[PDB]
Design a protein around this nucleic acid. Sequence first.
DNA 1: CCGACTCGCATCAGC
DNA 2: GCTGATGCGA
DNA 3: GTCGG
Length: 323
Amino acid sequence: PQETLNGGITDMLTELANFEKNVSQAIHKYNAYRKAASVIAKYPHKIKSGAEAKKLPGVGTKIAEKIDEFLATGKLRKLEKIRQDDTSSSINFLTRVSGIGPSAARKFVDEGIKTLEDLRKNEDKLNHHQRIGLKYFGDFEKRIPREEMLQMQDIVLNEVKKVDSEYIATVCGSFRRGAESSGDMDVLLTHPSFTSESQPKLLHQVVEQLQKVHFITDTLSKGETKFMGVCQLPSKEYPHRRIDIRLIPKDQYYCGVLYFTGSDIFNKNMRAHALEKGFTINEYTIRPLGVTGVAGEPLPVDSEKDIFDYIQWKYREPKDRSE
DNA sequence: CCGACTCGCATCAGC
DNA sequence: GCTGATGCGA
DNA sequence: GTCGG
Ligand SMILES: Cc1cn([C@H]2C[C@H](O)[C@@H](COP(=O)(O)CP(=O)(O)OP(=O)(O)O)O2)c(=O)[nH]c1=O
Ligand SMILES: [Mn+2]
Ligand SMILES: [Mn+2]
Ligand code: NA
């Protein structure tokens, strides 16, 4: 109990979570373990028994028993076995390549493809996404310091303005909450030519411009509203980074900014209280619920705070939206 | 006991 | 060819 | 996996 508290426990749960998702293809068990780890990581005491943990929300009989075994013996038989298993271990590892999920990792391992070498020997069996994830395997597992994030913002906002002075672009995600470190760059984008009732050609032009100045280096996926790609600060070379660009209608922009800024936990808390007050919020709109529960028409939103107001909540600055 | 627990894009199965 | 299903990362 | 209905 030094790393935060219950670090040994949260790592245990996270590992179990990873095998459920990657080997068992059980997203819900995966989410249960991660939630349980997140509750425990916040619990301000060193846990001394499964019974104590069982009283936490999201901790049931099974994770309680795992904790008693971990506390009594210093390990978990099930995790040690999983850890040493060639097939489970290799399946779990390969999903760390972006574009290889549980299904592709299982097929690869079935035909003897188990390592990065194996993948590099068999590039022909990889789709485009998977090829790039392989290419930048190490880069993609590095975190992005805020200062590189700011340099990256400088480039995104400048180049967007150069395409069209009318574009609005906002870096959201952990960056906007003031995180000192980020896993990727999330960019929201809008324009007056694009409303909920309106050829978008607005995302392609920005993507194209960022490729011309050699900021974006590869494309993982690109449609009329969402781009997923790779980018790189100009120089010893900087790591290649993940960037997502989303084009959203102007009249749903602040709903998107809120959704793609806030931590997942924060978004959940706000969705709950919004129901409490008879509102349903998604990433694009806020709607009132009628007396039966049916949804009305979207309400006007001219500011992130307008959303807080609708549901009678004190404005929470992005820096304070970790939960 | 037992079912519950979002979306845009790429690719593939199949028609 | 196209449509729908499945996979994927968010 | 946990937790309701
Ligand atoms: C995946 C996911 C995302 N969101 C919103 C909120 C999130 O903040 C924003 C950016 O998403 P992400 O880039 O994937 C992680 P992030 O917050 O930016 O932190 P880092 O990337 O730096 O690790 O989208 C959800 O509401 N529910 C979700 O399930
Ligand atoms: Mn992010
Ligand atoms: Mn992202
Ligand atoms: Na993956």
